[PDB]
Design an enzyme around this catalytic site. Structure first.
Site, short mmCIF file in Angstrom:
data_model
loop_
_atom_site.label_atom_id
_atom_site.label_comp_id
_atom_site.label_asym_id
_atom_site.label_seq_id
_atom_site.Cartn_x
_atom_site.Cartn_y
_atom_site.Cartn_z
N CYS A 1 -1.72 8.92 -8.83
CA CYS A 1 -2.91 9.40 -9.07
C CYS A 1 -3.92 9.51 -7.68
O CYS A 1 -3.18 8.85 -6.66
CB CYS A 1 -3.79 8.63 -10.14
SG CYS A 1 -4.52 6.97 -9.54
N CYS B 1 3.62 4.29 -4.90
CA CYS B 1 2.86 3.31 -5.61
C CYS B 1 3.50 2.67 -6.86
O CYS B 1 4.34 3.44 -7.36
CB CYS B 1 1.28 3.58 -5.44
SG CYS B 1 1.37 4.85 -7.21
N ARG C 1 -2.46 -10.72 -7.65
CA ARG C 1 -2.26 -10.39 -6.07
C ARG C 1 -2.71 -11.62 -5.55
O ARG C 1 -3.87 -11.78 -5.60
CB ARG C 1 -2.62 -9.25 -6.02
CG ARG C 1 -2.25 -8.58 -4.64
CD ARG C 1 -3.06 -7.26 -4.17
NE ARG C 1 -3.05 -6.18 -4.99
CZ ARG C 1 -3.99 -5.36 -5.32
NH1 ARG C 1 -5.52 -5.37 -5.04
NH2 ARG C 1 -4.00 -4.26 -6.10
N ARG D 1 -9.92 -7.07 0.64
CA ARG D 1 -8.40 -6.93 0.45
C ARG D 1 -7.82 -7.41 1.38
O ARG D 1 -8.50 -8.25 2.46
CB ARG D 1 -8.27 -5.43 0.37
CG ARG D 1 -8.74 -4.67 -0.87
CD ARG D 1 -8.17 -5.48 -2.02
NE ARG D 1 -8.84 -4.90 -3.54
CZ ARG D 1 -9.71 -5.63 -3.94
NH1 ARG D 1 -10.31 -6.68 -3.40
NH2 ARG D 1 -10.16 -5.18 -5.07
C1 SRM Z 1 0.35 -2.21 -5.25
C2 SRM Z 1 -0.39 -1.05 -4.72
C3 SRM Z 1 0.61 0.13 -4.51
C4 SRM Z 1 1.97 -0.31 -4.03
O1 SRM Z 1 2.67 0.30 -4.90
O2 SRM Z 1 2.00 -0.79 -2.98
C5 SRM Z 1 -1.85 -0.78 -5.41
C6 SRM Z 1 -1.98 -0.94 -6.74
C7 SRM Z 1 -2.99 -0.41 -7.63
N1 SRM Z 1 -4.12 -0.22 -6.82
FE1 SRM Z 1 -4.70 0.14 -4.98
N2 SRM Z 1 -2.93 -0.49 -4.47
C8 SRM Z 1 -2.34 -0.54 -3.23
C9 SRM Z 1 -2.80 0.02 -1.92
C10 SRM Z 1 -3.94 0.88 -2.06
C11 SRM Z 1 -4.18 1.83 -1.06
C12 SRM Z 1 -3.51 1.85 0.26
C13 SRM Z 1 -3.84 0.76 1.16
O3 SRM Z 1 -4.65 -0.10 0.95
O4 SRM Z 1 -2.86 0.40 2.36
C14 SRM Z 1 -5.14 2.39 -1.27
C15 SRM Z 1 -5.63 3.82 -0.63
C16 SRM Z 1 -6.70 3.50 0.67
C17 SRM Z 1 -8.04 3.31 0.17
O5 SRM Z 1 -8.48 2.37 -0.47
O6 SRM Z 1 -8.76 4.36 0.49
C18 SRM Z 1 -5.62 1.84 -2.79
C19 SRM Z 1 -6.66 2.40 -3.28
C20 SRM Z 1 -6.90 2.12 -4.61
C21 SRM Z 1 -8.06 2.65 -5.32
C22 SRM Z 1 -9.05 3.68 -5.06
C23 SRM Z 1 -10.29 2.88 -4.44
C24 SRM Z 1 -11.37 3.74 -3.84
O7 SRM Z 1 -12.01 3.43 -2.97
O8 SRM Z 1 -11.39 4.76 -4.47
C25 SRM Z 1 -8.16 2.18 -6.67
C26 SRM Z 1 -8.98 1.84 -7.99
C27 SRM Z 1 -10.45 1.49 -7.78
O9 SRM Z 1 -10.42 0.52 -7.21
O10 SRM Z 1 -11.30 2.08 -8.22
C28 SRM Z 1 -6.82 1.12 -6.49
C29 SRM Z 1 -6.34 0.61 -7.77
C30 SRM Z 1 -5.19 -0.36 -7.73
C31 SRM Z 1 -4.64 -0.95 -9.13
C32 SRM Z 1 -5.13 -2.55 -8.90
C33 SRM Z 1 -5.14 -0.36 -10.52
C34 SRM Z 1 -6.36 -1.01 -11.12
O11 SRM Z 1 -7.60 -0.76 -10.53
O12 SRM Z 1 -6.37 -1.43 -12.47
C35 SRM Z 1 -3.18 -0.48 -8.92
C36 SRM Z 1 -2.36 -1.71 -9.79
C37 SRM Z 1 -1.00 -1.12 -10.18
C38 SRM Z 1 -0.06 -2.13 -10.61
O13 SRM Z 1 0.46 -2.11 -12.04
O14 SRM Z 1 0.17 -2.89 -9.78
N3 SRM Z 1 -6.32 1.32 -5.50
N4 SRM Z 1 -4.66 1.28 -2.98
C39 SRM Z 1 -1.25 -1.49 -3.37
C40 SRM Z 1 -2.00 -2.81 -3.50
C41 SRM Z 1 -1.98 -3.29 -2.03
C42 SRM Z 1 -2.88 -4.82 -2.00
O15 SRM Z 1 -1.84 -5.65 -1.72
O16 SRM Z 1 -3.81 -5.12 -2.01
S1 SF4 Z 2 -4.06 3.51 -9.30
FE1 SF4 Z 2 -3.06 5.60 -9.10
S2 SF4 Z 2 -2.27 5.64 -6.79
FE2 SF4 Z 2 -2.97 3.11 -7.41
S3 SF4 Z 2 -0.98 2.23 -8.26
FE3 SF4 Z 2 -1.99 3.21 -10.02
S4 SF4 Z 2 -1.16 5.30 -10.26
FE4 SF4 Z 2 -0.51 4.48 -8.22
#
Ligand code: SRM
Ligand code: SF4
Ligand SMILES: [K+]
EC number: 1.8.1.2
Length: 453
Positions: free
Chosen positions: A362, A317, A2, A64
């Protein structure tokens, strides 16, 4: 992989570089636009030389991508706001938990400010930015059945002149760094810290550290969160073409060479591209003389295939097959699910309307279902928790309506509800607001205390 890409602005030269790598060095061969205005490669069999060669870099860095409203109605405000998102990004470049930041240009909340830790809402006077209202503490992540976790909206701190921007940004980060929970990572996020110490305590500490006093919030309102699909007039003789990209997944599909079309456009495009927070792409700064040329390529590649306003306002997502935390399908479920919603919308005579509908695989909430009017949160294969009651502008968290149900069960609930909205809604009343007014779902007024039943 990313990329760090403040404001989603990427040059055509950079695009061609990523386009190549995606096609030749990854298992999936796709470019996946994310909802935080950047992109991802899936299945990388390095990339850093390539990114670095075109002036790009992939992000213990608990920060981020910094977001910036991509297509402001007042087109001239973008440059300045963009410049500030870039400065904040660099300023924060090397926390208890990850930190998310945005720069917002009302009346658009396309960046979904309430899902972020720190937000700078641009206040402009005479076409010039004069300052920012600061909102702190948003976050959507929860844990199923864990009432100690919750999604929360950001709280208003106050207004600050442009000059104090970086000092305030730094002060919020450091205060969160020092006060964040020093044990349980599931409570480390700023939203938890604010609830523990209180907004006023946190705000006072920020003023102390920044060396300023916040002025009262300057008036601002939001009218929506969607992209402006199609052509919009920018400054001078420039135009912006936003292309709807389902799930932001860029790949060549049979008879719809989306990936090649974008490469062909990047080769003749004058300005640059802008990745939106809705996983779409803006071909920015197209001179009037070039519109027809760009439109021809986009048109023939299937990049301009008309979709319903509903599909345009739906998001999911990544989830399976690449996300290791996935519980239910999201990206791969959304297309056919919206096919079904489209039918429901037609059946009720609201085909021209839209409901901000999102599916997250999730409870981590990447699909931002916790700020949708109708949010689907994955619980197991084929099962989701259905949340209702958010609003179109994204300032309210939807409460859980039904739990652990399947698509057929979801469609049946929505058929009935959309039917009622269609006939009982007031002039221009959104679906989410309707469910709350009609007593279908109780509103979430104070997430930290009333989100869970
Ligand atoms: C690609 C994306 C979804 C999408 O379809 O667009 C995404 C994808 C993933 N997110 Fe995210 N997140 C995405 C936006 C967000 C959002 C929304 C936002 O930021 O606008 C959130 C919700 C708001 C928030 O943060 O509260 C979000 C909250 C999380 C979390 C939970 C964080 C937490 O504080 O608990 C995780 C897991 C973790 O880090 O523990 C996570 C984890 C991940 C991971 C990297 C899984 C991992 O930890 O191994 C996912 C990768 C999936 C894949 O196969 O690509 N992602 N994730 C977005 C990547 C954005 C970016 O460029 O950085
Ligand atoms: S961590 Fe959960 S909410 Fe984020 S991309 Fe994976 S399945 Fe979607
Ligand atoms: K999209």
């Amino acid at each position: 992989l990313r990329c760090r890409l403040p404001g989603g602005v990427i040059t055509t030269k950079q695009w061609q570089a990523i386009d190549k790598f995606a096609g030749e060095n990854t298992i999936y061969g796709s470019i996946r636009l994310t909802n935080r205005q950047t992109f991802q490669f899936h299945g990388i069999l390095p990339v850093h030389q390539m990114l670095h060669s075109v002036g790009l870099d992939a992000l213990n860095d608990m920060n981020r991508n910094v977001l910036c409203t991509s297509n402001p109605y007042e087109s001239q405000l973008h440059a300045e706001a963009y410049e500030w998102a870039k400065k904040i990004s660099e300023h924060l470049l090397p926390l208890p938990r990850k930190f998310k930041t945005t720069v917002v240009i009302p009346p658009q909340n396309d960046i979904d400010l309430h899902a972020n830790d720190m937000n700078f809402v641009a206040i402009a006077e005479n076409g010039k930015l004069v300052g920012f209202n600061l909102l702190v503490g948003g976050g959507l992540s929860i844990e199923h059945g864990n009432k100690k976790t919750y999604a929360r909206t950001a709280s208003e701190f106050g207004y600050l002149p442009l000059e104090h921007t970086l000092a305030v940004a730094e002060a919020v980060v450091t205060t969160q760094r020092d006060w964040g929970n020093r044990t349980d990572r599931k409570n480390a996020k700023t939203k938890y810290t604010l609830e523990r110490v209180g907004v006023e305590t946190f705000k006072a500490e920020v003023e102390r550290r920044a060396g300023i006093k916040f002025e009262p919030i300057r008036p601002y309102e939001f009218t929506g969160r969607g992209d402006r699909i199609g052509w919009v007039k920018g400054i001078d003789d420039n135009w912006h073409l936003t292309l709807f990209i389902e799930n932001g997944r860029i790949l060549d599909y049979p008879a719809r060479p989306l990936k090649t079309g974008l490469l062909e456009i990047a080769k003749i495009h004058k300005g640059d591209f802008r990745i939106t927070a809705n996983q779409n792409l803006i071909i920015a700064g197209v001179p009037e003389s070039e519109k027809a040329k760009i439109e021809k390529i986009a048109k023939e590649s299937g990049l301009m295939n008309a979709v319903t306003p509903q599909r345009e306002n739906s998001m999911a997502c990544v989830s399976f097959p690449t996300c290791p935390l996935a519980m239910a399908e999201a990206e791969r479920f959304l297309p056919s699910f919206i096919d079904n919603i489209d039918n429901l919308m037609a059946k009720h005579g609201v085909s021209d309307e839209h409901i901000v509908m999102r599916v997250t695989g999730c409870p981590n909430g990447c699909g931002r279902a916790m700020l949708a009017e109708v949010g689907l949160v994955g619980k197991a294969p084929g099962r989701y928790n259905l949340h209702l009651g958010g609003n179109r502008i994204g300032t309210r968290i939807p409460r859980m309506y039904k739990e652990n149900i399947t698509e057929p069960e979801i469609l049946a609930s929505l058929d009935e509800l959309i039917g009622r909205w269609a006939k009982e809604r007031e002039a221009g009343e959104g679906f989410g607001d309707f469910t709350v007014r009609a007593g279908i779902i109780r509103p979430v007024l104070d997430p930290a205390r009333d989100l869970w039943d």
